Nucleic acid binder design. Structure first.
Ligand code: MG
Ligand code: MG
Ligand code: MG
Length: 90
RNA sequence: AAGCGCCAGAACU
RNA sequence: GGCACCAUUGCACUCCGGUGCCAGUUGACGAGGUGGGGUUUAUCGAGAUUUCGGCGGAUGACUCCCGGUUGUUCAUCACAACCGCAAGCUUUUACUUAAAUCAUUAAGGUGACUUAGUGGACAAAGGUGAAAGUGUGAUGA
């Protein structure tokens, strides 16, 4: 069910990797400390983010609050990650 | 201190 | 990389779906070379991914020209090779710091890459000394 890492989609695909990476860090910093934000632009991974929190407590509040939030003209879609990330697992 | 200087093809961001 | 257009709403942790376009970055490593006029695809090695491809520069080669060596001192003249601040040809000999690639580890980059440093080597042609070997003729002292 719940996870340290959160899965975000429906992101604006037109925005470049690092700009998107640093703009997500601008909002999700309040919920807790972020370990890393993983963004790709490939066919299968575009418009998708993976914010890695240190506390699940933070990832829940981030999921609760930032659901449906218009980010770059497009509302966000947040779930928990299906499995734990490498930095969390190891 | 002239194999030296620029950069339509090409290739790699 | 970045603007668009088409496609994609997708659960990852070594990048990477197209085409059109406007910007990037790479695009020669060092030795050696200039009397004027033409003609032309301009010498020498090192590396190996492109130092490929197209474009200009140029001190190259061949040649005409003027100028001058060498062929036994010197003008005039044929010649024969040469040279443009050097100069017949042959052969050895001594100089003429090769750098890059490689390895490496920084620094600056979103990045392709960039600049710089360290260690370790290895050229070829040409030029310049030196030592033999060794190359003309008329007409004047
Ligand atoms: Mg060079
Ligand atoms: Mg040079
Ligand atoms: Mg090869």
């Amino acid at each position: 069910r719940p996870n340290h890492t959160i899965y975000i989609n429906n992101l604006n695909e037109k925005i470049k990797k690092d700009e998107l990476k640093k703009s997500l860090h601008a909002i999700f910093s309040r919920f807790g400390q972020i370990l890393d934000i993983l963004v790709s632009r490939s066919l299968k991974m575009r418009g998708q983010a993976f914010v890695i929190f240190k506390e699940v407590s933070s990832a829940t509040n981030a999921l609760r609050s930032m659901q449906g939030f218009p980010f770059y003209d497009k509302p966000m879609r947040i779930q928990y990650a299906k499995t734990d990330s490498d930095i969390i697992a190891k």
